[PDB]
Amino acid sequence: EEISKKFGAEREKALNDALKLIEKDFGKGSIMRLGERAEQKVQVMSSGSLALDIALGSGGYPKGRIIEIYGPESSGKTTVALHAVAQAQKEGGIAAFIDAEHALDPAYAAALGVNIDELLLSQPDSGEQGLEIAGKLIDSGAVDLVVVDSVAALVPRAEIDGDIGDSHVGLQARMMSQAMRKLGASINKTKTIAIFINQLREKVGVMFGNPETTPGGRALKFYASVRLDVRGNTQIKGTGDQKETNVGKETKIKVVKNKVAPPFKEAVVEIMYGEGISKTGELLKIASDLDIIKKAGAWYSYKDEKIGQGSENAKKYLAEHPEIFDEIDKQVR
Amino acid sequence: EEISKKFGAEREKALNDALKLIEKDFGKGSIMRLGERAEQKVQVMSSGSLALDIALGSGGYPKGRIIEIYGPESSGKTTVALHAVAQAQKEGGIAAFIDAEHALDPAYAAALGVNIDELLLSQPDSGEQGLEIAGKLIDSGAVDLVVVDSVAALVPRAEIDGDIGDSHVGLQARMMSQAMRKLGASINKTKTIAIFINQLREKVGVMFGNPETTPGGRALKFYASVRLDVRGNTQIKGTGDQKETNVGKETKIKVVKNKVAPPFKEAVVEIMYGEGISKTGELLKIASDLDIIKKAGAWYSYKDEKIGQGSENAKKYLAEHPEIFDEIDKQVR
Amino acid sequence: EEISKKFGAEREKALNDALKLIEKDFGKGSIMRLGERAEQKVQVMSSGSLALDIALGSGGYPKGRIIEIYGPESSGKTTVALHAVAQAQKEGGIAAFIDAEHALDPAYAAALGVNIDELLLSQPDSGEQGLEIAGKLIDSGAVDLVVVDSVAALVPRAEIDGDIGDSHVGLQARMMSQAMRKLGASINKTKTIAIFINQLREKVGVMFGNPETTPGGRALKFYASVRLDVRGNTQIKGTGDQKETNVGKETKIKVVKNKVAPPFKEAVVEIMYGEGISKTGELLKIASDLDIIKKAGAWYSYKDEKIGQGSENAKKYLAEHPEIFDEIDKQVR
Amino acid sequence: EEISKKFGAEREKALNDALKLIEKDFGKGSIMRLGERAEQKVQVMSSGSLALDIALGSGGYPKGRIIEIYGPESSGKTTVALHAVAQAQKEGGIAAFIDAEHALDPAYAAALGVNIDELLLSQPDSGEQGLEIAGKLIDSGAVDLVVVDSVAALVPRAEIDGDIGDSHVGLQARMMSQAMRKLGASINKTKTIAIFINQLREKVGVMFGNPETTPGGRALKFYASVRLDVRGNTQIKGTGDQKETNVGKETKIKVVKNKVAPPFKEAVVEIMYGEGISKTGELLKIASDLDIIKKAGAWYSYKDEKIGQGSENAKKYLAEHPEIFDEIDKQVR
DNA sequence: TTTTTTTTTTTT
Numbered sequence A, B, C, D: 001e002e003i004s005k006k007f008g009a010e011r012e013k014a015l016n017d018a019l020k021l022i023e024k025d026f027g028k029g030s031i032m033r034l035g036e037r038a039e040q041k042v043q044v045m046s047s048g049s050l051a052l053d054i055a056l057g058s059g060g061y062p063k064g065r066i067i068e069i070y071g072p073e074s075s076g077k078t079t080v081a082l083h084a085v086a087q088a089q090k091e092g093g094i095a096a097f098i099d100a101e102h103a104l105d106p107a108y109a110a111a112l113g114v115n116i117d118e119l120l121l122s123q124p125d126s127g128e129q130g131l132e133i134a135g136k137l138i139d140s141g142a143v144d145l146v147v148v149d150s151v152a153a154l155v156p157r158a159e160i161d162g163d164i165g166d167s168h169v170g171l172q173a174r175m176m177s178q179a180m181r182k183l184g185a186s187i188n189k190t191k192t193i194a195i196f197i198n199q200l201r202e203k204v205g206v207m208f209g210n211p212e213t214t215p216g217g218r219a220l221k222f223y224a225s226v227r228l229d230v231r232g233n234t235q236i237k238g239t240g241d242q243k244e245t246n247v248g249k250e251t252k253i254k255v256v257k258n259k260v261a262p263p264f265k266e267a268v269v270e271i272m273y274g275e276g277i278s279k280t281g282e283l284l285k286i287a288s289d290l291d292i293i294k295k296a297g298a299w300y301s302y303k304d305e306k307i308g309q310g311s312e313n314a315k316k317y318l319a320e321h322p323e324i325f326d327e328i329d330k331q332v333r
Numbered sequence E: 001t002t003t004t005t006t007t008t009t010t011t012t
């Protein structure tokens, strides 16, 4: 009743008839050669921290993918996301933070650089409405970056009504693994960054390596393209009120799984309290090891205003004058 | 059959249709711009102790979050909570202590300043009725500050009936990590202070730094917004019974994680036995280093009643005459 | 009205009348003797990794079968499939990758050895067009190897439109166990490799053995003929820029079910970041155990450039000169 | 006008007039007394595996019946069927394997003992031609054993042309329950073994016992006469490559429904990779329990070559000398 | 007629 034994005989007619037949129902761009598929070239969007951009390898987060960040107690996993929101918003793109922990005070965020009139914030109770407000945003609109914070706090609906301390086994993962399969396949058709910053909790029963995993389930880690781990709680004291007080936290960002460039190229980053991640104070250490500034215990030798050995080393004049940044940024590139 | 490949084209109609579609099911205030979301301005409520209030930076506990306090054996973690109840109760707000240790002697508590006929005390046995009596209080009522003390002693139900020495691995954190997910997402819809004070316990296997952690688990610290640590057990002997006897403990309050202002600005506080925290003796040290009250070993030089060098330094007239505090509290801002 | 008692009396007329009866309606090769049927001889295509071809026993994936690969987080289950695409594309055969995770960046792919203008990529949304685009490809054309990435990401149609977190019991397996029954019987009339690389998620309720299974359902395993599990996360630091940084990952491929050779004959494999599976540095270890290269901690003594004890051991001369490989591959046979 | 009310009065002429009337249109071999019907004495054909031949009780599969076997992933449900094919082919019998998964590689099967130019294989697509090619073979010829593997792969005709994932409820069962009623009533007229090996898939919604059933439908079991469940996946390491490597699989065969002997009489069996089921290694565990070989941890004491405690215990001499088996297999009666 | 997914530390 049908065609006979399909012996392997590569007739280009016998492939082009099928490559005409499977487009009468599914459009013109549902099967094509990759060398004419120019959309799969990973467009890159930067992050301000040149340490993190030279750490990622390709120079920023890949577009159309999912990145997740997690680190321990008060290590600025919110601040890197806020800096990325300001970075993606600066070059003409609309973003929409949504919150879970009810954590983003706007007066803190306004000092970093993110605007306030262009942040479509939300306050969901459950994850059932906490994720469709991202779904209908992405799959309809043309936003460029939308984050959801603290994915241990997307509480499912079936125990926002019940009692306390009962059996709800896997009832977080059975929402997260399903909403990821619904959401994160319709992102590459839009090429929009989506970040889910995470938590840390511990297991029981270990003889090897890691005692610290993430909640939400294993399904989040497989779909995520670039993972970031942010650790480090040592402190630095500056010349705050010309004396010794705490003015700087110092963390460390290591990239553990990446799909565009080799991972485990960790970076080193400093941050002051309130003024966000200091990009100019970041610039000095990464220009020191390339020796475009000469590192010495008495006199930083090279250009831009005869530094010395204070604390506001370069920041006393290149925060005063712009347009010295682009001769250094592409130069260290 | 649906909308086709969603090309990135920033049409404000193509976002405004979504910003009409996602409000027919979740009301009018489920997504809006932050520049018109004036409710996220952090309402600040002070706490009487001017050293703690200048120590936080913002000037009080941020209204609508969770704060936690812990310190070692008998250092007054209860007294700062009681003083916060009195401060939130002074300006027209119903408060509700509940106990776990069965430790609040009311005759002590009446002398600090909190009333007794406006305090919804309870006696929960386990955590099962221990936090539903907080949940149905917060998520229904309009209270302004509730506390639940000693979260090491919210014993779970599954071993309030069994023998002693039974394997119950994780059965405190497996209650707390779900109880906080039930509570601390529905606090910001009422903007109500909730405090959980804590005990300190040690670990085994140490090569770096801290040998003292907290029980309850890692889920409590992440959702907590402002932490406070209370240490210090030196004593002071005053003119008690005209004699060198014990009248005063002296503790040191440090802020280790904050979300509204830079942390690690610790204060210095005194406390007398029975009279609660002493704000007047707290006032002299913080007025000394700004020299509104002049520091001298023979004669405290400035205004209000010609101090001298006794022990009741300023307290012998400002406890007897009011309207001298308004020229001091806003003046030291 | 019909034939009488069919007593067993083996007349070859009484079977040859049936073997001329049942072929006038169903062609000539619907039933024949197996010893005159040379088509059941399992034609084997290699995979480049000599550890894998000495591991599989018969020297590669057998044609006309379905293989699957699964491993934990970021262990190169994509990379072995890419190397198989390169091996099937090298000796004159058209291949067609398709994606589900929207994962394969082409700039990474062009480095391993796969061509770009001879790859029929696709971007399906649902599993509906996810598998019929494989069915119409195999059952019509004459492709030689076609893979499908991440069969846990082939979401069915009936909940690509529904809400989040609803009753959708078995709706992945109820597509997979039917589409496999429609697909995987028409492969052996064409003898074409089909690879379905997979995921890993856990169960609940365990007493014995395995807590890590696969999604998709039980039907994917049973029709699969050759299974591969790829584990391992140790690292090796090479002489990257005369610095000890990360340039080498190391996995461990084990074969757990086979139908052409005994199972459990696991293999060892290294991988560098970007150059794919390094077959050259892999060749030295499998030549060590047969001692055609003399393994010594000071001087690799045998032929081909008189190696020594560096890091680029053999690749410093056989990546510069060819035809030393065919006197080695059939030599280690 | 007809015969009157049939009063019960057992006259032998009143029975013999009916028992001559009802045979001139239905033949003589349609009704007879049981005590002379020598066909219903169940002729038994053995199975090679002596533990299975003591497990069935009657010493093999009863002829004229339909037996079926099923077990989970890779427990050798193909191998027991191939061994039964070789056992029926050994004593003068022509057999006809047919395949559904297109799974029997001939080079594996040639090692077990089944001849290759005497196996009428077929390659069906649908179940429509998949079962009539067995029907016309059984009902016409005088074949002695014929199997059809994997009855979850006999896909019906009505969706071999349709799309993927449509409403086809019970479309497998309405083929199977009808073709079994057409086929398996004409087996007692020929006394031919027919085996249908099976799969295992899981039900949803349970409160008692078994969560695992078989596909194909319910009407397979009612017509089946002997069922067998084949589980067990633990391994044994022998002296392969004078090394403890994987050379041995060990399963467990139970009989759960039988119509000639009581059920639940399971057996134990071993299988090596490539050489099939080992009958000599099967003989030792069944000869130890009747102490024809004495079980001792240091010296297997009894006859046949003064065994000792190696791994090939009996295989060092009865692999080369025959006719010591005939004084054993009848001896263990 | 077919599975889907983990969760939490305790103490010298």
Ligand SMILES: Nc1ncnc2c1ncn2[C@@H]1O[C@H](COP(=O)(O)OP(=O)(O)OP(O)(O)=S)[C@@H](O)[C@H]1O
Residues within 6 Å of the ligand: A072, A073, A074, A075, A076, A077, A078, A079, A103, A107, A108, A109, A249, A273, A274, B222, B257, B258, B259, B260, B261, B262, B263
């Ligand atoms: N706007 C701000 N003003 C002052 N200090 C801040 C501000 N934001 C953050 N910090 C502090 O600086 C650090 C950076 O913040 P985060 O890394 O986000 O803290 P955290 O450990 O992530 O806890 P979360 O996730 O914010 S609840 C922390 O130590 C904060 O206490």
Ligand SMILES: Nc1ncnc2c1ncn2[C@@H]1O[C@H](COP(=O)(O)OP(=O)(O)OP(O)(O)=S)[C@@H](O)[C@H]1O
Residues within 6 Å of the ligand: B072, B073, B074, B075, B076, B077, B078, B079, B103, B107, B108, B109, B249, B273, B274
């Ligand atoms: N009402 C009171 N009258 C007299 N002494 C008091 C009173 N309340 C507290 N104290 C003492 O003053 C100090 C302050 O109390 P706390 O810091 O609460 O003691 P503690 O170490 O916290 O133990 P807990 O948690 O209160 S049971 C302690 O040294 C108490 O012994």
Ligand SMILES: Nc1ncnc2c1ncn2[C@@H]1O[C@H](COP(=O)(O)OP(=O)(O)OP(O)(O)=S)[C@@H](O)[C@H]1O
Residues within 6 Å of the ligand: A222, A257, A258, A259, A260, A261, A262, A263, C072, C073, C074, C075, C076, C077, C078, C079, C103, C107, C108, C109, C249, C273, C274
């Ligand atoms: N083209 C590439 N460039 C740089 N690093 C790569 C590239 N491909 C893979 N890697 C890395 O090398 C390893 C091999 O990749 P994979 O095994 O495919 O990762 P994975 O664990 O399988 O996750 P998936 O399935 O690819 S999303 C991983 O650690 C990747 O981060």
Ligand SMILES: Nc1ncnc2c1ncn2[C@@H]1O[C@H](COP(=O)(O)OP(=O)(O)OP(O)(O)=S)[C@@H](O)[C@H]1O
Residues within 6 Å of the ligand: C222, C257, C258, C259, C260, C261, C262, C263, D072, D073, D074, D075, D076, D077, D078, D079, D103, D107, D108, D109, D249, D273, D274
């Ligand atoms: N000819 C062979 N050569 C090597 N190994 C074999 C061969 N036949 C079977 N095996 C292996 O030995 C075991 C017995 O085979 P089977 O019982 O057929 O496996 P299975 O679980 O039944 O899967 P199926 O039914 O064959 S698809 C399995 O673990 C096979 O991997």
